[PDB]
Every structure is written in C-alpha cells, then in structure tokens.
Amino acid sequence: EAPAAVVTGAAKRIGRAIAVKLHQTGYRVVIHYHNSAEAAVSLADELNKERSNTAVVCQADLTNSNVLPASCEEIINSCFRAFGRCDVLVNNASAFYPTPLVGKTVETQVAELIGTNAIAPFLLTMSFAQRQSNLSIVNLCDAMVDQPCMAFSLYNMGKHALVGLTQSAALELAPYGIRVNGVAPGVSLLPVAMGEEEKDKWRRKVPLGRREASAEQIADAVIFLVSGSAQYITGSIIKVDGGLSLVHA
Amino acid sequence: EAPAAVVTGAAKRIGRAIAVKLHQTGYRVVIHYHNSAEAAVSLADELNKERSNTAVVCQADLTNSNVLPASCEEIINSCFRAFGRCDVLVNNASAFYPTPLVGKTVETQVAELIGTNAIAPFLLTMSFAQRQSSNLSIVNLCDAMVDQPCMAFSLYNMGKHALVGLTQSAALELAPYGIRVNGVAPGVSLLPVAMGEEEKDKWRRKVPLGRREASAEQIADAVIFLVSGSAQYITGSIIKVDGGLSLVHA
Amino acid sequence: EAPAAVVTGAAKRIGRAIAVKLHQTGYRVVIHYHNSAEAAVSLADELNKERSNTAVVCQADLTNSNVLPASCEEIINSCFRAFGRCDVLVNNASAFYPTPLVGKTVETQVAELIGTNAIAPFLLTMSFAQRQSNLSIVNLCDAMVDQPCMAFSLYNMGKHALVGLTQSAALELAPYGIRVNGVAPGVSLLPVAMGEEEKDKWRRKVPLGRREASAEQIADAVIFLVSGSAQYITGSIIKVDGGLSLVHA
Amino acid sequence: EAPAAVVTGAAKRIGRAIAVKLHQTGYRVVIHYHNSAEAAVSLADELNKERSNTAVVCQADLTNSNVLPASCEEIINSCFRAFGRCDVLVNNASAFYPTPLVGKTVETQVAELIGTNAIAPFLLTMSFAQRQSNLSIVNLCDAMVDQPCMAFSLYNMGKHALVGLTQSAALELAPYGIRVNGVAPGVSLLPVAMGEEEKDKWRRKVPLGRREASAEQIADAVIFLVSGSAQYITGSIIKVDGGLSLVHA
Ligand SMILES: NC(=O)c1ccc[n+]([C@@H]2O[C@H](COP(=O)([O-])OP(=O)(O)OC[C@H]3O[C@@H](n4cnc5c(N)ncnc54)[C@H](OP(=O)(O)O)[C@@H]3O)[C@@H](O)[C@H]2O)c1
Ligand SMILES: NC(=O)c1ccc[n+]([C@@H]2O[C@H](COP(=O)([O-])OP(=O)(O)OC[C@H]3O[C@@H](n4cnc5c(N)ncnc54)[C@H](OP(=O)(O)O)[C@@H]3O)[C@@H](O)[C@H]2O)c1
Ligand SMILES: NC(=O)c1ccc[n+]([C@@H]2O[C@H](COP(=O)([O-])OP(=O)(O)OC[C@H]3O[C@@H](n4cnc5c(N)ncnc54)[C@H](OP(=O)(O)O)[C@@H]3O)[C@@H](O)[C@H]2O)c1
Ligand SMILES: NC(=O)c1ccc[n+]([C@@H]2O[C@H](COP(=O)([O-])OP(=O)(O)OC[C@H]3O[C@@H](n4cnc5c(N)ncnc54)[C@H](OP(=O)(O)O)[C@@H]3O)[C@@H](O)[C@H]2O)c1
C-alpha cells in the first residue's frame, strides 16, 4: 500500500511542486489550500487522472484563532479518512508581508503571520503525532532567517519559531520513529508582483548561477528528507539557497 | 533628568533584580507585573524610599489576545505618564511550562507561551519605538539553551526562538532611529520556586563554571552593560550568561 | 563517460563506505589513504573486479607541512592521471585524539589535527578548483562542533575551520559552478575496539533509535549532495546525527 | 595588588585601545608586538609615565612554525617576569589578507593566517592555563564569520577555528576558574590609509549610525568581559557590530 502525505498550501508554487513530486514518488496526497480553490482542485484532477484515488483537497485558514486546533486536526483527519494513514506532513503554507514596527490590524497580522508560519505547524505536528514505516515531517524554513528582511519582524519571528519547533519536535518525536526536518529556500519563484529591477537585484546576489531556485529544486530536498536515504536525519535544516545566505552586505 | 525604564515581570526574581539595578544606576522604573501585586508594590515602595517618585507599578496580562496590542501600548504609555519619557524596555515576563506533543486548553497554552515570550515583546517594541544626545535600548530575556530544547517544551521553545528573531529584526529596523535591541540569555539562574533539592542540584552539577546557577544579579549585570554607554555600538547581540552550560554535550 | 571522485581516508570505515557508494552509483574513484595500505589496495581490487579500470589508490600524509600543498596537488593530479577528470572531492580523512590544555609534541599535534581536518581540505579544494558537469566538494564536519568534547580543542578547532572553508569555498567557487557542502555525523561507526560499556553510553544518548549511524547512512547524505537533486545546494551542512546535537547536558 | 594582562598585537589600533583601557582600569600590561617596535615602545613609555613599571613590551612572530609554542610560552613568561602574575590574556594579533582559491607561497599564508588567528591563541591559552580571583581570556573574533569576505578562506578558517577554541577552552578551563570569551567586531577602525570613499562603502552598510566602531567601543566589550560584572559569562562571543552581521546581501 502507498504512503500518504499532507502538504499545506499545496495549490501553487513551491507547495504544488512538493505535492507533485511526492505523488511522482508514489505518495497519495492531501492538497491543503486556503483561497486557491480552483488551482487545488485542478491539481487533484491532474494527479488522480495519473493514478486513481491518490489525491484529495482540504480547505482551511491557518490563521491563529480559537478554532485553529480543530482546523489542524481536520486536515490530518482528511488524510486518514481518504487514505487510511498519514506518513508525511509538509508544513509549507505561509503568509508573508511587511509589518513595520514604526489595512489589517496588528492583531490580525500577528494571527496570520505567527499562525501560518508557526502555530499551525505545531498543531498539525501534534495531530499527526497523536494519530500514530518511514514517518516524517518537513518544515519550510528560511535560509536567511538570521539576516531578516527590513520590516518583516512578524514573518521572521514565525520562521524562527518554526526552527524551534523543528528541533523540539525532532527531539520529542524521535522515540516514536517520527523524524522532523526543515528545507530552507533562499529565493525561489520570484512573484509576478515584482519588478524587473527588483528581480534582477535578487538574482545578481545569488552566488550559484545568479538565479532563483525552481520550485522543483526545493521539492528535491523535501523528497530526500522523507526518503529512506535520510533515515538517521532528524532536526536538520537543509538550505537550498545557491549560497545566498553566505553573502555579506 | 533621570532616564526611565520599563521592566516586564519585574515583581520578583530576575525582573526585580533588573529593575533594582537600573534604579541604582539612576533610572526611574515602571515595574510591570501580572499576578504578583503585593511583591510589585512592595518593590515600588523600597525604591521610592530611596528616591521619591522614581518607581510605579503597572498591571497587565501579556497573554496573546486581540487586546494585547492595547495592553502593550498602555504599558509604554504608563512610563510616559509617570516619567515623561521611556529610554529602556526590558522584556523579561515569561510563561514557562511543558506542552507535550503527544487542563489548560491548547489555545490557552499557545496564547500564554507565545504571547508572553514573543508577541508581547513585539508589541511592546512597536509601542516603545512609536511613542518616541540619548541612549534608547531594548533588552530581551532569551534562552542560552534555545537550540538544545527541554523535552516537551515546544511552545516555550518556539516563543524563545521567535524572541531571537524579534531581537535581530528589531535591531535591524530600529537602528536608524537610534534604538539598540539586544538579548541576555541565561542558562540556569534562579531555580523554580517549587523545585526541590535532588533536582536543583542536578541542574547545578551540569554547569561547567562553578557547578551553580546564575544569581539574578549576574543576569542583571549583563542587562546593565547593554543599556550602558559601554555598549553604544552593540545591537542585535545576544549575550549568553550561562557558565558554559550551553557548550556541554549530552 | 563515468565521472570521477577523490575520497580522502577512504581505505576503511566511513571513507570506505563513501567510496563504495559513489562507485555503486557509477563513479570511478581515487581511494586516498595514509597508513591503511592493505585495506586500500584490497578495496581498489574489489571495485575494479566489479568494473575494470574504475579505482586506484593514492597514498599521502595530510599532516600540515611546507610540502602539504604539493601533496594535495598530487592527489588531484592522480585522479586526472587515472581518469582524465575529477568531478567530486570528499574531504573525509581526519586525525582525532585529545590535546589537553593543561608521546607527540604539541607541534606535531597541531600539524596533524589542524592539517588533516582543515588545511589539507583547503589545499585539496584549491587544487580541485585550479585543475578545473556537476562538480562538487563534500566536507566531513561534526554535528557536535558547538558542544565540543572535553580536551579536544585542536580537533574541534580543525572542524570549525572546516565549517568556515565549506562556507568560504561555496561562495568563491560558485561562479565556477563548483558546489561545496558538508555532511556532519553525530556518532557513526563506533570503533569495533572501543569498550562495549563506552559504546552503549554513546548509543543511549541518541534520540532517534538509541544507536550510532551506520557508515552507509553517512554516505547516503554524501550521495545526495553530489547528485543532480542537489544542484542548487551549496554552503549547506547536513547533520546526520539522529538528533544528538539537540540534547542538552 | 594590581592584576596583569597580556594583549597580543597591542602596538596600535584595536589592540592598543584594549591595552590602554585595561591599564586605565588598573591593570599592568604586556604589550606584545611583531613589527611595530617604535609604537610598542612608545606606548609602554606613555603608560609607565602614568604609573611606574606597569607596562612592558614583548616581540614575537605568531606565524605557525616549530618554534611558535616556545614563543607563546615566553610571552606568558614575560608577564610573570615583569609582574609576577598573569590574570588576563587578550588574543588580538592577526594577519589579514586575501588568499584566492584560484609573492608569498601558500604554505606561508597558511602559517601566517592560521598561526596568528588560531594556533597562537591556542598555544598562549595552554601556557596561560599551565602557569596558573578573576582569570579570563578574550579572543578577538569576527561578527561576519558566517558571511565571509570573498577570497579570504584562510583568514575565515582561522577566525572559525578561534570560535572553536573559545568554546573548547571555556569548557575545559571552567574548573580552573578561567573564563574564555570573545569580542566580535563587524567593521572597526578602518585602515587610516584606505580612501575615505572606500571607508564610506563599509560605513553605509552599518545599520547603527552608518559608521564603523571606534577601537574604544571594541575595547569597552573587552573590559566588560574581564570585569567582575561578567563573572558567570564563559564561552560567549559578543558582537560589537552596529548590526552589520544582520544585513542581508
Ligand atoms: N519563495 C521563496 O523564495 C521562499 C523563501 C524563503 C522561504 N520560503 C518558504 O517556502 C514555503 C513556500 O514558499 P512560497 O513562495 O511557495 O509560498 P507562498 O506562495 O507565499 O504561500 C504558499 C501558500 O500558503 C498559503 N497560505 C497563505 N496564507 C494562508 C492562510 N492564512 N491559511 C492557510 N494557508 C495560507 C496560500 O494558500 P492559497 O494560495 O490556497 O491561499 C499559498 O498558496 C513558505 O513556507 C515560505 O515561507 C519561500
Ligand atoms: N530562571 C532561569 O534559569 C531562566 C532560564 C532561561 C531563560 N530565562 C528567562 O529569563 C527571564 C526571567 O526568568 P525568571 O525565572 O525570573 O522568570 P519567571 O519567574 O518564570 O517569570 C517572570 C515573570 O513573568 C511574568 N509572567 C508570567 N506569565 C505572565 C503573563 N501571562 N502575563 C504577564 N506576565 C507574566 C510573571 O509575573 P507575575 O509574577 O506578576 O504574575 C513572573 O513574575 C524569563 O524571560 C526567562 O524565560 C530564565
Ligand atoms: N565516526 C564518527 O562518529 C564521526 C563523528 C563526527 C565526525 N566524523 C567525521 O567523519 C569522517 C570519517 O570518520 P571516521 O570515524 O571514519 O574517521 P577515522 O576512522 O578516524 O579516520 C578516517 C581516515 O583518516 C585518515 N587519516 C588520519 N590521519 C591522517 C593523516 N595524517 N594523513 C592522511 N590521512 C589520515 C586515516 O587513513 P589511514 O587509515 O589510511 O591511515 C583514517 O583511515 C572524519 O572526517 C570524521 O572527523 C566522524
Ligand atoms: N578592524 C576590524 O574591523 C575587525 C573586524 C573583524 C575582526 N577584527 C579583529 O579584531 C582584532 C583587531 O583588529 P585590527 O584591525 O586592529 O587588527 P590589525 O591592525 O590588522 O592587526 C593587529 C596586529 O596584529 C599583529 N600581527 C599581524 N601579523 C602578526 C604576526 N605574524 N605575528 C604577531 N603579530 C602579528 C600586528 O602587529 P605589528 O603591527 O606589531 O606587526 C598588528 O598590529 C583582530 O584579531 C581582527 O581580526 C577586526
């Protein structure tokens, strides 16, 4: 029987590439999404056309609130309901925008940035562990977490907290055979929202090829960590950044 | 005119040691507290006996909620109200208890552990900056053992990791405003009030430098250094005060 | 045409396992050794018996000296002489013994521990780059480098230097398309000879399975890093440590 | 009576500021130097004029060689000869120049850069410990050690090794009551001869004040670490960098 994975924020960009690559490796997948319903459904259709009954969708807002724990339990339950098992969890969903220290209320900014990047991953990890082979969790971290973008305090706080969870959960879940690791992009998939000077600016900074990573290149590191070639790896965060984090100001 | 400082969770233990040391150094202090009203007012009294109108208490819950930003703005406002200025913010208040992955609800555990150790610091830092020859700084109480977490303390550890991020992010963003943001990271310092002595000494024997926990004063000494003119170029630095504990393998 | 790899300290233990796995993967290999002449020649014999003309040995002392640069240049030259190309360098060879602060002279301890663990990797890197495809270098680091063993200051200084080399070379060699990464064991392959009681003491410290890594598990991470699935990864150090580095005192 | 301190490389710039500030705090000092004999002699004169026979000079090359251990033992011996005690060691002396991976020979660059930045500090640390209250060692590290300057591998390796020494020696010397810490400048006291327009290119990068640290600001962290206000501080590296290491590419 085929193992099953949950991928959060899987309708597009990097999460989509991760879902596709896991599916290509033999996994049945739960495609979690928030607003991108059309793309999520379209992906499930593509994957199921490829192998019957190997993809479902699960919608949820991963903003922090009093109902988040239940939402996270529901996402995990989705995988068990469809597939009878949940082997892999990939915490990819993430809000990202500036929150200057000096439009949304600040409390809403806290809820979204800290929720998606950290609390939800924790609650998902909890539900995943409680519901239990090669079991593992992969968290999408930031290679430049110690050289933060100006004015992105809350995002960066969420991403540091995710490092904490990766390490703490690796330690605590190791007794149950559940590995917990991170994959930490530098820049990958520059937005269409972004100008040509701005994109070029980022690309010129990347030592290895002066270009951003493709989504597939991020997904390759996820595949490695969930594989049997990573059986002794837990609590490790693998940068997939082309050397970007090594470049001083 | 004397500068003024806000210390969170300053009614007892390390926070009090910090408020006391700042006060001795010439600061006027806002003693924030949550449940320890008697301890806070008593400290405020001691300090005002030393110098009149140099201490005030300020009560606030720093659990995450949708009014936390208001609460944090009020704390800073209380320093301006009392003293006409606010030079130093120390983020010391902290909830600490296990939250196993496998009867406070989890919502409450998330709110208290992430609110006190990270979100309140952020919102206080926001309010401190917004409300502004001077020496403005923020000191965050971090964990020296943040990368070797205690078993079953994931939310507390997430909170402290987030506080590293805030220290770095805020150092970067507030530097152009003349506001320095640093950390002090104890290893083991004042042991929990309810801990016994088979266990207190088990923590003590782990510490390379002296086989003993740090005194509150020793933690405060590092805080006083970072707020001082002797640290005028230091920002985004987290100073470990751990007797080498973080260097010891399993 | 088959790519080629130099593995230092490859006659036994972890370097041998890395050489065996690269070879099983399709590489021709230079098996470098210092003293284990017999284990080394036996390994080339066996690999060549499996695929003709795919392994050679190369003897060099990697202690620091004024001749170390020529010795490192010759190692890389030996790979080109045998195979016509040099695609991969694995800096595995390492002296390891205590050097307390309070039979070998200190001169000799410095030369052996700092030479093998840091200066030879640097010179081999230089010769690798100067002599020049998915080109990459993998350095064998320590997962515990920031929680050092008591009385192992020079060994630890070496392994820290190795971290700096991994990062500096990743940055500098990126424009040439050469990736530089690290694999960081916690405990792996305990000396057959170390006492059993001491062995079980190390084993009981590892969160994931309460056992040391196999040599093959370490090699798996090397294989990942030199592969086409790691083409945007440079300057990354992957712990393969079962969470050991995460455990407080 | 008054404590005593060795400062390596103390004839000018940051080492000189450290020596002066220690002396002003009440220490007697050994002013170590290599080439700068006029400045070292002149400094000791100035300090002895303040307080009689509270300063001596000591010349030594700290390049790695077979005689480096005796050289370092003689530096510590010189403190004992002059003042009968040695309470503080400041490892400040450092060679700094590029060593590209692609007329000094490379073995000489290894010897100078690894010798001054790491091996001499180790040797001085050994001698200091052997010859033994508030005893401590302060090592001059880099805030930018994980974002290395392009083509400065050997220097960066040296500074990484020095982090490792700081930590290893803190652990090992703690039972002797000797604390071991570091001070990590970002950019400080730029060379007088560097054009001001090149100086401004570094300055512009520093978040706190768009300027470099004074030598005195660096010395202030050293004075803190050696003081009774840092009596529980060991194995800590304090960045004094105006936020520079936080700024991304
Ligand atoms: N791209 C990079 O260069 C880069 C760099 C560093 C780190 N990362 C990390 O790598 C991961 C993938 O990056 P990305 O650029 O692909 O991410 P992204 O496109 O910014 O976001 C991925 C998905 O997150 C989901 N999401 C956002 N807010 C949400 C909410 N409130 N509740 C539930 N889901 C929500 C969205 O779902 P819907 O679209 O369905 O609304 C979105 O598709 C992220 O964790 C990111 O932080 C990426
Ligand atoms: N002690 C150590 O060994 C150690 C180790 C590592 C890190 N640290 C860090 O150093 C700091 C001081 O340590 P400590 O042991 O002195 O701290 P503590 O005694 O555990 O807590 C300090 C104060 O935090 C306040 N607090 C707790 N929950 C709160 C809430 N919901 N809202 C507002 N305030 C709240 C309490 O105020 P009231 O009493 O008024 O309710 C308490 O007095 C903490 O940040 C801690 O994490 C300490
Ligand atoms: N085993 C672990 O738990 C562990 C933990 C952390 C890091 N690592 C790292 O992983 C790598 C492999 O570990 P290992 O246990 O397999 O190493 P090892 O058995 O201690 O050393 C491997 C080889 O190093 C070579 N070597 C030693 N001194 C040399 C010299 N002066 N010149 C040239 N070569 C020399 C030896 O070659 P000859 O036999 O031919 O003389 C030896 O076979 C090392 O870099 C090590 O530091 C291992
Ligand atoms: N300046 C910065 O921005 C910066 C940044 C990062 C780290 N640091 C560190 O802070 C410390 C002080 O920096 P700096 O800029 O003041 O250093 P520096 O001027 O480049 O060098 C300091 C002294 O090192 C001595 N030295 C050089 N080679 C030597 C050798 N082979 N043997 C013995 N002594 C030798 C020299 O002595 P003589 O003059 O007597 O020959 C020199 O005066 C250094 O360890 C440095 O790496 C500084």
Ligand SMILES: CN(C)c1nc(N)nc2[nH]c(-c3ccccc3)c(-c3ccccc3)c12
């Ligand atoms: C949709 N995008 C742009 C992202 N989405 C999410 N959820 N997280 C992101 N993190 C980054 C980022 C963060 C720090 C340093 C570099 C890239 C990014 C980012 C920022 C710039 C260019 C490309 C990616 C990012």
Ligand SMILES: CN(C)c1nc(N)nc2[nH]c(-c3ccccc3)c(-c3ccccc3)c12
């Ligand atoms: C009241 N106490 C005990 C604390 N309070 C707060 N708010 N934070 C704390 N953090 C720790 C701690 C964390 C990691 C490693 C060691 C101690 C502790 C801690 C835990 C055990 C022994 C001493 C201190 C701690």
Ligand SMILES: CN(C)c1nc(N)nc2[nH]c(-c3ccccc3)c(-c3ccccc3)c12
């Ligand atoms: C042959 N051995 C014993 C080694 N050889 C080399 N070249 N390097 C080694 N590094 C380690 C090590 C170092 C720090 C923490 C754990 C293992 C070790 C090590 C030390 C103890 C048990 C297992 C491995 C080691």
Ligand SMILES: CN(C)c1nc(N)nc2[nH]c(-c3ccccc3)c(-c3ccccc3)c12
């Ligand atoms: C005399 N100088 C220039 C130095 N001397 C020594 N012994 N070490 C030095 N380290 C640096 C440095 C290294 C990395 C990043 C920034 C500055 C420097 C440095 C490099 C550039 C500008 C100012 C200082 C430096």
